[PDB]
Amino acid sequence: AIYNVEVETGDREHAGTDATITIRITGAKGRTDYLKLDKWFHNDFEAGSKEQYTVQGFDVGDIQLIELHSDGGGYWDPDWFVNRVIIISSTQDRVYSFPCFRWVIKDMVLFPGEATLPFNEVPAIVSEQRQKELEQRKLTYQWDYVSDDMPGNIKAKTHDDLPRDVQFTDEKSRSYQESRKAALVNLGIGSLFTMFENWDSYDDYHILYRNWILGGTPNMADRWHEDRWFGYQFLNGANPVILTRCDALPSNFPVTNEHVNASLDRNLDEEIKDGHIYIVDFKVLVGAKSYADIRYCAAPLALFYVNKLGHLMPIAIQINQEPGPENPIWTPHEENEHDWMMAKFWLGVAESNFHQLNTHLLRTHLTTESFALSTWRNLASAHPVFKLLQPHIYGVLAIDTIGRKELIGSGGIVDQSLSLGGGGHVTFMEKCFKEVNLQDYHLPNALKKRGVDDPSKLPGFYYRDDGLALWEAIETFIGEIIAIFYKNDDDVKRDNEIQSWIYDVHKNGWRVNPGHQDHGVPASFESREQLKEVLTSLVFTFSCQHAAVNFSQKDHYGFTPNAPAVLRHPPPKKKGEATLQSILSTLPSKSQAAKAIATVYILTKFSEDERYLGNYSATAWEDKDALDAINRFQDKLEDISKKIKQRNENLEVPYIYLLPERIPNGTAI
């Protein structure tokens, strides 16, 4: 009898309703009857309201769960986004919290505070009510596949076709669209599009980014031409992947001491084997270019060497896999300057497509999408991990939906930007995926398994430093939570839910279809340290990974000559033919280069309603310990944030892509 119901409404556009809301409290001695919550001569549940409704009914025992019920809205978006509900029984000395943060269509059952594992002590009704929702989730979130060689994704024709809980905030859409090719016009590039001519000089390209006032001028926009900075980027550029330490030269990359020598402080075979030689091998390329707009791309491999002064230097570039008089080994000593510059460019077009399609779209978006769908399908609003993932899985589902049309679809801004845009990009994506493995998403392992792990040999690798820093915090945090709710490795095995989660991804997420090699995803969890491992990788990829590989694009591609996406001619068959003209009639044309900035501009736009790593402002989480763990976590993030800046306050080109307050909680683009 007599309950105080504090009903805070989210501030999301539309978060409010004008539907007749009634609540039904249920508990020990029983349940009441839907009580109308509504202040007179007052507009209840608006914009981002927070109201205290006093109502009176049967005396439900200890309140075991509540039920909010709406009704089509009012005459003059009856979808209500409830943030939280906090009721108080005038007969119970507790303060029932009911974190929600979801849209309330017709109904919405909410369990009290503390997050629980499906097996924890739950009154009969609170389960069956939980198992209840799960049957519903596996109904409004079902798999669909585009092909046998792509991770499964959420079924939904259009963005607005998928569940409102996963849809883009009006702001995300507004930001998306405004930023869309609408923002192409504000860049002052519009004309270049209808311009299929060449450029007069490297420096000419510079225009494409003048009216892109934000973020500032691209880093490499004034050092791109320099070998030293050309190498720098393989460590701190947008593709911090690929580069692996070279223990021995690949049999088809006949680099000899008689090739490099010149660029060696301190021998070659001695250098290799002394940890001062790293290599990049784009063998995965072999796709279809073009889209007479004829495009090109290679599958080269380059050799780098760490200077007497820690600079990773480009010493050898074989444009294509099969060595030969036709695919020569280009050195930074090519007596014909242009020929070496042309080599680097080719290495560039390759990286560009490799990076955009593979290490960004597939490896951060598309693949981890599966996990996020598994999250809604298998974990319940109550499960600790659902509450842990929620703030990180947002935006993938939405942006990927949009993306399959707008991004990688035909005539999509990407499609008509890379040299694999004809559709070769779709097939190439499949190749890359047939080889993705969950063990790749583990930064520490990955880094280490590449021989890129050591500071003394490979100095100046901030992606690594900054990455590991964040990973160790993310890992730490995730850990403690698992601890809180998972008392031991048995609770893990016991958790039927987390078992279904990781399994949905195993058998339907990254399907190990024919060609594919095992995708390294478990089929169940055996320990806590393992659950921790997967979870950490997953969130680190949703946040840190994505940011360091995507948001670094304005700088990277900023001045297209620094990272060409398309090449209009075949690669040098002989040597010494490269002309400023030639290598300028090969680089992306005026409109092509315009299509780049355009794509990149849209790809790298933060919305106003963004939340970063720390932020959990709109998460369930009631348990005191968790909250602490969180703040503990946020405290480490701060440190990293400071320490990182000190680092930058001290180097020629500051690595700011992994700064906590720039790393979105998830992947929304």
Binding residues for Fe ion, rule: CB under 5 A, are 550, 669
Written as six digits, the tokens of 164 are 């409102």
Least spacing, CB of residue 15 vs Ca ion, in Å = 6
CA distance 508 to 526: 20
Closer residue to Ca ion (CB): 82 or 187: 82
18 contacts which partner out of Ca ion, Fe ion, none, CB within 5 to 8 A by kind?
Ca ion
Report whether 311 belongs to an annotated binding site: no
Q: H helices of 165-317, where?
A: 170-179, 182-185, 190-193, 227-236, 257-260, 268-271
Exposed / middle / buried, residue 277 (Cβ in 10 Å: 0-12, 13-18, 19+): buried
Closer residue to Ca ion (CB): 40 or 214: 40
Report whether 281 belongs to an annotated binding site: no
Report whether 365 belongs to an annotated binding site: yes
Closer residue to Ca ion (CB): 43 or 631: 43
Exposed / middle / buried, residue 462 (Cβ in 10 Å: 0-12, 13-18, 19+): buried
Quick count: other Cβ atoms within 10 Å of Cβ 265? 12
Report whether 550 belongs to an annotated binding site: yes
Report whether 38 belongs to an annotated binding site: no
38 contacts which partner out of Fe ion, Ca ion, none, CB within 5 to 8 A by kind?
Ca ion
- The strand ranges marked E within 129-203 are 143-144, 153-154
Strands of the 301-306 sheet, one edge to the other: 244-245, 277-281, 301-306, 312-318, 329-330
In one letter, which amino acid is 658?
A: L
Give the residue among 584, 594, 281, 285 at the shortest CA–CA distance from 420: 285
- The strand ranges marked E within 565-617 are none
Least spacing, CB of residue 102 vs Ca ion, in Å = 13
669 contacts which partner out of Fe ion, Ca ion, none, CB within 5 to 8 A by kind?
Fe ion
Least spacing, CB of residue 603 vs Fe ion, in Å = 6
Give the residue among 152, 620, 597 at the shortest CA–CA distance from 388: 620
14 contacts which partner out of Ca ion, Fe ion, none, CB within 5 to 8 A by kind?
Ca ion
Written as six digits, the tokens of 237 are 């550029």
Least spacing, CB of residue 163 vs Ca ion, in Å = 16
42 contacts which partner out of Fe ion, Ca ion, none, CB within 5 to 8 A by kind?
Ca ion
Reduce the DSSP state of residue 235 to 3 states and report it: helix
Assign residue 520 a region (left: φ > 0; alpha: ψ between -120 and 50; beta: otherwise): left
Least spacing, CB of residue 581 vs Fe ion, in Å = 36
Closer residue to Fe ion (CB): 551 or 616: 551
CA distance 278 to 251: 15
Closer residue to Ca ion (CB): 11 or 77: 77
Report whether 14 belongs to an annotated binding site: yes
The CA–CA distances, whole Å, from 41 to 38, 44, 649 equal 9, 9, 58
Report whether 562 belongs to an annotated binding site: no
Q: Which residue of this chain has its Cβ atom nearest to Ca ion in the complex? A: 77
CA distance 323 to 321: 6
Report whether 333 belongs to an annotated binding site: no
Least spacing, CB of residue 534 vs Fe ion, in Å = 22
DSSP state at residue 144: E
Least spacing, CB of residue 21 vs Ca ion, in Å = 9
Closer residue to Fe ion (CB): 403 or 588: 403
Please provide residue 279's backbone torsions phi and psi, each rounded to the nearest 5 degrees: -140, 155
Closer residue to Fe ion (CB): 550 or 589: 550
3-state helix, strand, coil in the chain (%, to 5): 40, 10, 50
Least spacing, CB of residue 571 vs Ca ion, in Å = 56
77 contacts which partner out of Ca ion, Fe ion, none, CB within 5 to 8 A by kind?
Ca ion
Report whether 133 belongs to an annotated binding site: no
Reduce the DSSP state of residue 377 to 3 states and report it: helix
Quick count: other Cβ atoms within 10 Å of Cβ 627? 13
Closer residue to Ca ion (CB): 14 or 431: 14
Report whether 489 belongs to an annotated binding site: no
43 contacts which partner out of Fe ion, Ca ion, none, CB within 5 to 8 A by kind?
Ca ion
In one letter, which amino acid is 188?
A: G
Least spacing, CB of residue 107 vs Ca ion, in Å = 16
Report whether 546 belongs to an annotated binding site: yes
Closer residue to Ca ion (CB): 372 or 398: 398
607 contacts which partner out of Fe ion, Ca ion, none, CB within 5 to 8 A by kind?
none
Report whether 320 belongs to an annotated binding site: no
Q: Can you give the binding site for Ca ion, defined by CB under 5 A? A: 14, 18, 38, 42-46, 77, 79
Binding-site positions for Fe cation read 360, 365, 546, 550, 669
Give the residue ranges of the annotated binding site for Ca(2+).
14, 16-18, 43-44, 46, 77, 79
Binding residue ranges? 14, 16-18, 43-44, 46, 77, 79, 360, 365, 546, 550, 669
